[PDB]
Symmetry: C3
Subunit: 97 residues, 3 copies
């Protein structure tokens, strides 16, 4: 499993949420941040944790929905996640052997 | 080392802090976030040794759970190096 | 690639910002957080760099964020497998 982290223009949040929803990715954590790629501008961090095989689909959904083609569009990082635990059940999601 | 990241109900922060404190885990970073499994949630991050992960995860699950939808999730991410800014001492993951 | 994550005193942000700029590290994400060591207001700074730039980035942050007192914070180095430029769709793979 992987964490897909995108830092986007704040106005793109609804586009990104919709593009992820449409593909079955509803779960997300959103953080208000500041960034730059000269003052720090308001940006929005979107984080989703998905199965390895869903990464490329998630990355492409975010790129398509967050892009303008201008500087300041932001970046997406893919970080490994070793375990994902559902607090309500205690069930842990891992990659088989 | 691992970073244990939990996204919990904001009212559960003190429960989680206490459960971690009781087991010797005092250090933490807390961020105000929004989420859906967008409502206000709290992100708690602790960086621990590999052998402490299961204990930390179970302390958070026990103290943040309600059994209802919206309890949140815990992610375990690898940490390769941890540096103390005050001393410049670096802890490097076993190899 | 790696993500270098530093949790620093809020007053040190400008020092860190400048020390990274001077070395060619302009890209960064900043988050307002609360923290305590092993809750007070702190600042999280995140930079994603090539593997060979990590030690230089860590050095720049340590030098610019330190006071020598307790509460100076910590730096964590986390692996980044893919880095995507949203504007072009170009992906850098580790």
């Amino acid at each position: 499993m992987k964490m897909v982290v995108a830092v986007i223009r704040p106005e793109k949040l609804e586009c990104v949420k919709k593009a992820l929803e449409e593909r079955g990715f509803v779960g997300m954590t959103v953080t208000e941040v500041k960034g730059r790629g000269v003052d720090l501008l308001q940006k929005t961090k979107v984080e989703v944790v998905v199965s390895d095989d869903a990464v490329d689909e998630v990355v492409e959904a975010i790129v398509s929905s967050a892009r303008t083609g201008k500087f300041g569009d932001g970046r997406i990082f893919v970080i490994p996640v070793e375990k994902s635990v559902k607090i309500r059940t205690g069930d842990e999601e891992v990659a088989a052997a």
